[PDB]
Ligand binder design. Structure first.
Ligand SMILES: CCCCCCCCCCCCCCCCCC(=O)OC[C@H](COP(=O)([O-])OCC[N+](C)(C)C)OC(=O)CCCCCCCCCCCCCCCCC
Ligand SMILES: CCCCCCCCCCCCCCCCCC(=O)OC[C@H](COP(=O)([O-])OCC[N+](C)(C)C)OC(=O)CCCCCCCCCCCCCCCCC
Ligand SMILES: CCCCCCCCCCCCCCCCCC(=O)OC[C@H](COP(=O)(O)OCCN)OC(=O)CCCCCCCCCCCCCCCCC
Ligand code: SF4
Lengths: 98, 96, 59, 175, 99, 115, 83, 97, 318, 155, 284, 70
């Protein structure tokens, strides 16, 4: 399979790993989220444009407009976290515990 | 005023399109001869270079069916120059 | 506003003590009540209309 | 060079992804992602996706990530945790520059790389298809089908987006 | 679907796009319309598992039409042998190769 | 070919412009010169604090509207369809949904953002 | 009646903007239904020949389709240039 | 017709300022191309003018000399170059030279 | 000879930018009974050169709490976008005849906000930070009306190809069909371009200088150049959009006469407005756009999406 | 020779430095509004090429205009350092020059030069608008007689 | 580990918001160069504002104890430095009151004429400078051309531009130069047009109103109790004016319409001032 | 007066003049007098590739008509 296709596939994998391998900023975790779909948006356009799947051309936008909606939730949840705690830290996001 | 002008452009567009419709026969025939001729040039090159391969019968039909398939562009311009490849793949695409 | 001068004369040829009623002083004093419930870009507006010049409010 | 131009574009895309995935400072993480966002459209533009390529620039490059800068401007971790501040992020960056450099070398010699999927290291240009599109841009006609055949999709997308503004206020209201 | 409501009331919601050989805007084809049409009509009213083996020739041909794996593998071996041959200087490309 | 060349040439011309705008006027520097300026007094330590919700709220609302306008760029090509009746119904449906989200936003305090 | 006229005028007193937009939106959603040119719009939209009308095999007994792109048979758009 | 007269007055400015040389001289030395009647001259080379048609202020003005007390002053300009007896008239403190 | 054409476009644009400050200073000055620069050269013709090379020779202090690298990339992004704004313009025959030039032009214009965000962040000052955040939220709020207006206006054109705009306006100006949108477009560009009354981004009286609070000499020139470069191109974009002009294929000269005259006149109105109206306030700025501008734009877009079907005057996409 | 080529290069820099210096008026007292009167279309120093610019990082010359107090003193100094080189300060008014009327009082610094290196001393109480405009003319004349490149050549 | 709280409302942490004490001025252009305004903000919303004054504090009263009455007179000229002659009016009225000496009627009429000319001087900058901070800059030079004209009038009589030192205890120092009444009459005729110029520019403009209307409103009682005076009260509808209630000098032998507003916000005072401009022109 | 502003904008007319005149003349000069034949769709592009191949000098702008056919 064309060398180009693997570049986005490995781009997703390292982006997915960055989403899973946390640190101290779910800001940075969120940045791995839309980037993860950005590879999905980029890759999806690649096959769809290549194979001349004309009606499928809608889907890259459909993926786009919905993965964008998650940012609305994700960032809104963030300021809620950065309100009761002030910051966007993750190790302090453990109030649940028991 | 814009209503009348736009209607005139639509008459102009279909007039332009109709000229293209008349131009399809010659263009299709010319491209039809060109693409298969250039494929034959590829096959002719294949049986001067794969003669030494232990198992390479020239012109293997990669697809199982006998139905014609449009040449994939890789086997079309693969043995051409850098200029031929660039001007064919993204030649329309670049065109600022 | 009301620019008043209060001086006490000691009976000599020179003033003994002169206090001046600066209209800006009271107005700048009320600038706190002005700014309540207003935009920061409106604090400049209220400051402008309060006709404050600091040579007068600072004595 | 122009032999493998899209090889380059996809290569900066990978390193651009390694940037923000290495968890740098969120403003700099945005920089690494938008760089990948910018270079990615060029990959799409090379394939004829002019409209789709321009979209990520308009709604994602200059769109989504702009409001992201606000949360970064809102968070403002008490010291910048940029690349030089931490040493594991450098290790993440240095590592993330290794395998794709390793495997592209693996690819470019024998073309037989079998990581998960069988991948060919052949030039990007090959998989293109030969044939005129007449006067209708295939990308434009497909997108314009939103209002012709994508009736069901656009209702659900519209309804969900309408719910999107409903939820956003409710969560951000804070009772 | 789990509840094929589309089939019951006969209103088309998604299946217009689910395959590329269906109706297309301005009546323009996909890359592999010919192969997908052949595989699809082979595997109608047959069963998923039955068509897994019976309509095998059509599927692989259609997959090769879409991915174009073995075809460019053919080309890659052609190019690899060429660069392993002309560099040593036994055969020279004809003028039409170079224009 | 010409496109990224135009981006390249513009990027260089910008970079040489800033380059000799730095090294050529380099004369002398001090810490006070590099010190932050805050209306002419001492900076107490700032630019590290959150700004309530209103700037964030309008940011999210912009994105949601921006995503909805993203759905309606293809209209000039959509007008060239064969079934206009399907088009004008759906295109209108997007438009009054823009209104509905704005209309909902307005009545529930909304664009009268926090203070 | 009295309330409606008062409310509309009273609304047009404080806000002229949204009443104008509501009038525009309320208007533009209506005329396309009763417009006599929408049928023309689709007709000229259908008349544009983006793709080539591939000929059909002449097996006889279809007089509707012409044998030459000048014969009176077939679809005609004499209305179009007048429209 | 009015625009013709204004253009005619514009050309008269060049003729008044000693042809092309003087017109370019005063423009690049005083940013003024308006010409008025000669009113006086000190023992310094300071040409003095007056034009009642102009509004109060610019109605009387000056172009300074080229040599002042053994100092080059063709490019540089100073306000204190004016002698005292003429400083009275120049500042409109007295409307008679 | 493509490269020479690229230079033949960018230096003259920059040369016009420098003289803006002169005409900015002079038209403003005369508009208020003043004179404007008339001492430095004939009628102040040399003032931009004096201003430009002085700021070039002025030492470029960087703030102590700067990210240097971010302090430099942002002005680079600001000016590079400003020049690349002009590459698809339909100047008789457009340089880069991108079929989606309008989409290209919008994307770069939206991407210009990254200069604002990084300018405030890299400066690292409370005044700079809030001034930048206030600046970016103003412009990003005004993107939505910017895109909708084009969608409505271009709907009668046929596509996003900027060159096609000439054919549409061959008979009458496009403003006559969409004058409600014309003023709708013009104000939104004024807010985008960050000119009075939409100067809160800079806030010369109350926000020091906004994102340029610290930017001095060298790196200030880029922002000042990028700001004024966008002024021409936005006015030029409005010039082609609504105030179209005839273009004879055998004489593209006449179209250049009309386009240049129109775009300079439109720029004249920009500072004309700047010399007449008080500065806006954020709540007014936010409220005006989202309460009296968005609903009007939405309805007008609804009017222009149905009108071609209403009158069977849909435009050809080619 | 090199002396001639360095004489024209500094002249080119000399031209802008005396024609594009953007002033700042540290508005303090009646001297400030007096400066504001020179801002009227009566004089319009902008016609000389100088425009009132805030953000001290952008300006070249700053004008003290009014009486200086100990309270105002540390801020006026510190803003002077952050003013980029070359930086010139002009003392407008007797109070700024040497205290003037408020020269003996307990809360005025006698003369602004005790805080900053004054370049041009403008007398007046207040100095009439064109008199302060004259001082600006002197500053450009003083700027004209500089040998920055000449000194480095002999350095 | 501890059991979860019964109400599930885990206890709120310490305060995570701040009021961002901001050091407004003095270099800031809107701070008149000499202001140390400091205030607290909840976002854009302001809680309290401390106008730190003193950045221009001078001896003034301290040295007046050591200067004679004549020597102390120029202090008032530099006190409210925009209203030059009006301050000396206060000093001369006070000093002559203690001396039980009244100035000749000619002196009284000169004082009121320049006093209202000073009223033109002060009101012009009061609105135009507010117009500068509010945005639109042109009204400044627009009218500061006129401000030069009565400044030229100041020079003709006293001999100085700003600090006239004209109003002295016992009348005025000198008499007007011959014909000065004529030139000021020419200015008076043309000045009413210039006032119309401003009202055309600002009064009906939406941007100016929305930045000014319903802003900084105060009730009558708080305004009076806060020690306010002049327009600050008259804008809030308070029926009071010194020239009318307690007519000093010759202000009794002249009628003028005090422009009382009825809102108390920023806008009412602006209209109150511009009418005071016209009513000042009546006095001339 | 106000006409002293005109030299300020007269130069501007020259500055904005250059980009329009250049790209017009370079397009004319490079493409043998004719304007740059634009290809917004693949059809117009493959039209040129026929022209470039059919010219015999590998330039599309070289036009050669009835003088060739026999
Ligand atoms: C609710 C408002 C929107 C839906 C109703 C109005 C539009 C109907 C429509 O487009 O139908 C398309 C189709 C019927 O197609 P049609 O016959 O209207 O148009 C066919 C057009 N071509 C030939 C180009 C494909 O119906 C649906 O998509 C129904 C979806 C569900 C509607 C109800 C949801 C609840
Ligand atoms: C069949 C017919 C179909 C179409 C009919 C359409 C309706 C009839 C036409 C209506 C008017 C046009 C559309 C609306 C335009 C106004 C939108 C709006 O919100 O207005 C009120 C708005 C807001 O006014 P407001 O804020 O006082 O009140 C709004 C209403 N409330 C109070 C409820 C919020 O006005 C402005 O924003 C003022 C201008 C701001 C910008 C400052 C610079 C102005 C420069 C003006 C001169 C230059 C003009 C250049 C024009 C272009 C040249 C190329
Ligand atoms: C043609 C026949 C119909 C003509 C029009 C008839 C109806 C007129 C309705 C007038 C507006 C609604 C009533 C009203 O006056 O609302 C005013 C109010 C103002 O709110 P605000 O500015 O915040 O001030 C109050 C709070 N301080 O408003 C509000 O608080 C709510 C504002 C909601 C704004 C929604 C805008 C949506 C986009 C524009 C409309 C697009 C078309 C929608 C479909 C229309 C179908 C008829
Ligand atoms: S020098 Fe005179 S005019 Fe200037 S501030 Fe001091 S007292 Fe006032």
């Amino acid at each position: 399979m064309p060398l180009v296709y693997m570049n986005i596939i490995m781009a997703f994998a390292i982006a997915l790993a960055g989403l899973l391998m946390y640190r101290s900023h779910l800001m940075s975790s969120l940045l791995c989220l839309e980037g993860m779909m950005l590879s999905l948006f980029i890759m999806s356009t690649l096959i769809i444009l290549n194979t001349h799947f004309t009606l499928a051309n809608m889907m890259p936008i459909i993926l786009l407009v919905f993965a964008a909606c998650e940012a609305a939730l994700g960032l809104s949840l963030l300021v809620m976290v950065s309100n009761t705690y002030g910051t966007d830290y993750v190790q302090n996001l453990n109030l649940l515990q028991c | 005023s814009m209503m009348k002008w736009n209607r005139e452009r639509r008459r102009l567009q279909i007039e332009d399109f109709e000229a293209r419709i008349a131009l399809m026969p010659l263009f299709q025939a010319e491209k039809d001869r060109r693409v298969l001729q250039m494929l034959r040039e590829n096959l002719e090159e294949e049986a001067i270079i794969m003669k030494d391969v232990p198992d390479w019968k020239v012109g293997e039909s990669v697809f199982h069916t006998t139905r014609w398939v449009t040449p994939m562009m890789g086997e079309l311009y693969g043995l051409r120059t850098n200029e031929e490849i660039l001007s064919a793949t993204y030649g329309f695409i670049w065109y600022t | 506003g009301e620019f008043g001068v209060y001086l006490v004369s000691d009976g000599s040829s020179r003033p003994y003590r002169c206090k001046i009623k600066a209209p800006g002083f009271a107005h700048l004093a009320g600038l706190d009540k002005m700014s309540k419930g207003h935009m920061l870009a409106d604090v400049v507006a209220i400051i402008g209309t309060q006709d404050i010049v600091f040579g007068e409010v600072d004595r | 060079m122009t032999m493998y131009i899209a090889f380059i574009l996809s290569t900066i895309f990978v390193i651009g992804f390694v940037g923000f995935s290495s968890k740098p400072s969120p403003i700099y993480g945005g920089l690494g992602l938008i760089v990948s966002g910018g270079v990615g459209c060029g990959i799409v533009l090379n394939f004829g996706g002019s409209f789709l390529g321009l979209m990520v620039f308009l709604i994602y490059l200059g769109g989504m990530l702009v409001v992201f800068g606000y949360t970064t401007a809102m968070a403002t971790e008490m010291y910048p945790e940029v690349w030089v501040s931490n040493k594991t992020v450098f290790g993440a960056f240095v590592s993330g520059l290794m395998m794709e450099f390793c495997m592209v070398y693996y690819a470019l010699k024998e073309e037989e790389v079998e990581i998960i999927f069988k991948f060919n290291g052949l030039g990007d240009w090959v998989i293109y298809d030969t044939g005129d599109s007449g006067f209708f841009s295939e990308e434009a006609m497909g997108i314009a089908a939103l209002y012709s055949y994508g009736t069901w999709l656009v209702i659900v997308t519209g309804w969900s987006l309408l719910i999107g503004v409903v939820v956003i206020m409710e969560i951000t209201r804070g009772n | 679907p789990f509840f094929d409501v589309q089939k019951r009331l006969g209103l088309d919601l998604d299946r217009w796009m689910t395959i590329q050989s269906a109706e297309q805007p301005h009546k323009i084809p996909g890359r592999c319309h010919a192969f997908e049409k052949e595989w699809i009509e082979c595997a109608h009213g047959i069963g998923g598992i039955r068509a897994e083996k019976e309509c095998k020739i059509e599927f692989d041909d259609f997959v090769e039409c879409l991915l174009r794996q073995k075809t460019m593998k053919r080309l890659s071996a052609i190019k690899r042998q060429r660069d392993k041959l002309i560099k040593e200087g036994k055969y020279t490309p004809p003028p039409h190769h170079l224009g | 070919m010409n496109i990224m060349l135009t981006l390249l040439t513009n990027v260089t011309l910008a970079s040489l412009l800033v380059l000799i705008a730095f090294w050529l006027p380099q004369l002398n520097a001090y810490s006070e010169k590099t010190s932050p300026y805050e209306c002419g007094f001492d900076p107490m330590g700032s630019a590290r604090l959150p700004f309530s919700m209103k700037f964030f709220l309008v940011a999210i609302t912009f994105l949601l509207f921006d995503l909805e306008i993203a759905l309606l760029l293809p209209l000039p090509w959509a007008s060239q369809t064969n079934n206009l009746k399907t088009m004008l119904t759906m295109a209108l449906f997007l438009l009054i949904l823009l209104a509905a989200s704005l209309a909902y936003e307005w009545t529930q305090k909304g664009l009268e953002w926090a203070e | 009646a009295g309330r409606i006229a008062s409310f509309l005028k009273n609304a047009w007193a404080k806000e002229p903007v949204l009443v104008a937009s509501f009038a525009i939106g309320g208007l533009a959603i209506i005329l396309p239904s009763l417009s006599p040119y929408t049928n023309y719009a689709i007709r000229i939209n259908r008349a544009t020949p983006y793709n080539y009308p591939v000929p059909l095999r002449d097996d006889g007994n279809m007089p509707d389709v012409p044998s030459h792109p000048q014969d009176p048979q077939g679809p005609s758009l004499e209305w179009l240039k007048n429209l | 017709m009015e625009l013709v007269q204004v253009l005619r007055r514009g050309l008269q400015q060049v003729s008044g300022h000693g042809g092309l040389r003087g017109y370019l001289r005063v423009l690049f030395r005083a940013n003024d191309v308006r010409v008025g009647t000669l009113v006086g001259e000190d023992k310094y080379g300071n040409k003095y003018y007056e034009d009642n048609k102009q509004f109060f202020g610019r109605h009387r003005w000056v172009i300074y000399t080229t040599e002042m007390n053994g100092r080059d002053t063709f490019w540089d300009v100073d306000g204190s170059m004016v002698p005292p007896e003429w400083h009275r008239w120049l500042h409109c403190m007295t409307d008679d030279p | 000879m493509f490269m020479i054409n690229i230079l033949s476009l960018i230096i003259p644009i920059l040369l016009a930018v420098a003289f803006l400050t002169l005409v900015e200073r002079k038209v403003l000055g005369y508009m208020q009974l003043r004179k404007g620069p008339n001492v430095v050269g004939p009628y102040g013709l040399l003032q931009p050169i004096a201003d430009a090379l002085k700021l070039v020779t002025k030492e470029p202090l960087r703030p102590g709490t700067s990210s240097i690298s971010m302090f430099i990339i942002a002005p680079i992004l600001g000016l590079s976008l400003a020049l690349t704004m002009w590459v698809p313009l339909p100047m008789p025959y457009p340089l880069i005849n991108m079929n989606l030039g309008v989409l290209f032009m919008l994307a770069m214009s939206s991407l210009a906000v990254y200069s604002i965000l990084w300018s405030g962040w890299a400066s690292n000052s409370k005044y700079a930070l809030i001034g930048a955040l206030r600046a970016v939220a103003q412009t990003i709020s005004y993107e939505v009306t910017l895109a909708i207006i084009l969608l409505s206006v271009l709907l009668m054109n046929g596509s996003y190809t900027l060159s096609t705009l000439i054919t549409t306006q061959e008979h009458i100006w496009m403003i006559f069909t969409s004058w409600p949108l014309a003023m709708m477009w013009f104000i939104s560009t004024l807010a985008e371009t960050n000119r009075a009354p939409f100067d809160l981004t800079e806030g010369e009286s109350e926000l020091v200088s906004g994102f340029n609070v610290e930017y001095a000499a060298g790196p200030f020139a880029m922002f000042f150049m990028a700001e004024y470069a966008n002024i021409i191109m936005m006015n030029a974009f409005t010039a082609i959009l609504f105030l179209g002009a005839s273009h004879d294929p055998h004489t593209p000269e006449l179209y250049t006469i009309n386009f240049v005259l129109k775009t300079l006149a439109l720029t004249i109105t920009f500072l004309w407005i700047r010399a007449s109206y008080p500065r806006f306030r954020y709540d007014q700025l936010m409220h005006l756009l989202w309460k009296s501008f968005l609903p009007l734009t939405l309805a007008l877009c609804m009017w222009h999406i149905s009108l071609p079907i209403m009158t069977a005057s849909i435009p050809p996409q080619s | 020779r090199g002396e001639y080529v360095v004489a024209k290069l500094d002249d080119l820099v000399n031209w802008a430095r005396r024609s594009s210096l953007w002033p700042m008026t540290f508005g303090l007292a009646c001297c400030a509004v007096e400066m504001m009167h020179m801002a009227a279309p009566r004089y319009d120093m902008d016609r000389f090429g100088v425009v009132f610019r805030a953000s001290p990082r952008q300006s070249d010359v700053m004008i003290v205009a009014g009486t200086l107090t100990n309270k105002m003193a540390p801020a006026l100094r510190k803003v002077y350092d952050q003013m980029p080189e070359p930086r010139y300060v002009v003392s407008m008014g007797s109070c700024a020059n040497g205290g003037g009327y408020y020269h003996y009082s307990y809360s005025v610094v006698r003369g602004c030069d005790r805080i900053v290196p004054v370049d041009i001393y403008v007398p007046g109480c207040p100095p009439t608008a064109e008199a302060l405009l004259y001082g600006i003319l002197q500053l450009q004349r003083k700027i004209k007689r500089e040998k920055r490149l000449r000194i480095w050549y002999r350095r | 580990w501890k059991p979860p709280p019964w109400n599930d409302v885990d206890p709120p942490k310490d305060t995570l918001v701040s009021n961002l004490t901001l050091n407004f001025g003095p270099q800031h252009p809107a701070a008149h160069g000499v202001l140390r305004l400091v205030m607290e903000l909840s976002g854009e919303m302001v809680r309290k504002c401390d106008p730190h004054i003193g950045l221009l504090h001078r001896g003034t009263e301290k040295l007046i104890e050591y200067k004679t009455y004549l020597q102390a007179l120029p202090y008032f000229d530099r006190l409210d430095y925009v209203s030059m002659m009006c301050n000396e009016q206060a000093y001369s009225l006070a000093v002559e009151k203690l001396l039980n000496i009244q100035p000749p009627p000619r002196a009284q009429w000169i004082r009121v004429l320049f006093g209202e000319i000073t009223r033109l001087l002060n009101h012009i900058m009061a609105v135009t400078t507010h117009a500068l901070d509010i945005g639109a800059m042109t009204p400044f030079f627009w009218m500061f051309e006129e401000r030069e004209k009565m400044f030229e009038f100041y020079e003709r009589v006293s001999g100085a531009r700003m600090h006239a030192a004209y109003i002295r205890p016992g009348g005025v120092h000198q008499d007007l130069p011959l014909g000065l009444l004529d030139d000021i009459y020419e200015f008076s005729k043309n000045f009413s047009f210039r006032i119309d110029e401003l009202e055309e520019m600002l009064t009906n403009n939406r941007i100016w109103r929305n930045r000014t209307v319903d802003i900084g409103v105060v009730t009558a009682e708080d305004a009076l109790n806060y020690g306010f005076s002049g327009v600050m009260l008259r804008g809030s509808g308070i029926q009071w004016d010194l020239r009318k209630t307690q007519p000093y000098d010759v202000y009794d032998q002249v009628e003028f319409d005090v422009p009382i507003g009825s809102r108390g916000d920023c806008y009412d005072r602006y209209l109150c001032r511009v009418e005071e401009m016209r009513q000042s022109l009546r006095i001339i | 007066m106000w006409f002293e502003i005109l030299p300020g904008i007269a130069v501007m007319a020259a500055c904005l003049f250059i980009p329009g005149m250049a790209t017009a003349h370079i397009h004319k000069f490079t493409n043998g007098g004719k304007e740059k034949r634009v290809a917004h769709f693949s059809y117009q592009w493959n039209l040129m590739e026929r022209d470039r191949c059919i010219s015999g000098v590998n330039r599309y702008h070289v036009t050669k008509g009835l003088e060739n056919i026999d």
